Write a protein that holds these residues in place. Structure first.
Motif, mmCIF file in Angstrom:
data_model
loop_
_atom_site.group_PDB
_atom_site.id
_atom_site.type_symbol
_atom_site.label_atom_id
_atom_site.label_comp_id
_atom_site.label_asym_id
_atom_site.label_seq_id
_atom_site.Cartn_x
_atom_site.Cartn_y
_atom_site.Cartn_z
ATOM 1 N N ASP A 29 0.849 -1.220 0.000
ATOM 2 C CA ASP A 29 0.000 0.000 0.000
ATOM 3 C C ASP A 29 0.877 1.260 0.000
ATOM 4 O OD1 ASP A 29 1.202 0.079 2.352
ATOM 5 O OD2 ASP A 29 -0.501 -0.523 3.527
ATOM 6 N N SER A 30 0.274 2.416 -0.109
ATOM 7 C CA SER A 30 1.066 3.684 -0.120
ATOM 8 C C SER A 30 1.822 3.857 1.199
ATOM 9 C CB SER A 30 0.130 4.881 -0.311
ATOM 10 O OG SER A 30 0.883 6.082 -0.211
ATOM 11 N N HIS A 70 -2.858 3.935 -4.510
ATOM 12 C CA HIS A 70 -1.543 4.241 -5.156
ATOM 13 C C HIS A 70 -1.787 5.118 -6.397
ATOM 14 C CE1 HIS A 70 2.771 3.350 -5.491
ATOM 15 N NE2 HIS A 70 2.677 2.800 -4.277
ATOM 16 N N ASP A 71 -2.733 6.018 -6.321
ATOM 17 C CA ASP A 71 -3.021 6.909 -7.489
ATOM 18 C C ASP A 71 -3.246 6.059 -8.741
ATOM 19 O OD1 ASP A 71 -3.139 9.526 -8.755
ATOM 20 O OD2 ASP A 71 -1.403 8.825 -9.821
#
Length: 71
Positions: A29-30, A70-71
């Motif tokens: 994940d981010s 994550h965009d």
């Protein structure tokens, strides 16, 4: 190099099937921490064992988690 599940679908690297049939994949994940997901469906056309509620397929979960967290 061509691994398959207990049925006959070729799963890609990272995915894994347990002796119970539930699938298992891993993504980041981010936050950079390792995260694991579970699913009784590999694709959206699969079906969960009688008595099991619907679940998000990995392909659909990975797409939504990585494209969103994550965009």
């Amino acid at each position: 190099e061509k691994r398959r599940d207990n049925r006959g679908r070729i799963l890609k690297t990272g995915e894994s099937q347990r002796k119970d049939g539930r699938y298992l994949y891993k993504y980041i994940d981010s936050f950079g921490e390792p995260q694991f997901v579970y699913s009784w469906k590999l694709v959206a056309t699969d079906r969960v064992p009688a008595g099991k509620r619907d679940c998000i397929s990995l392909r659909e979960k990975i797409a939504e988690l990585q494209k969103d967290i994550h965009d």
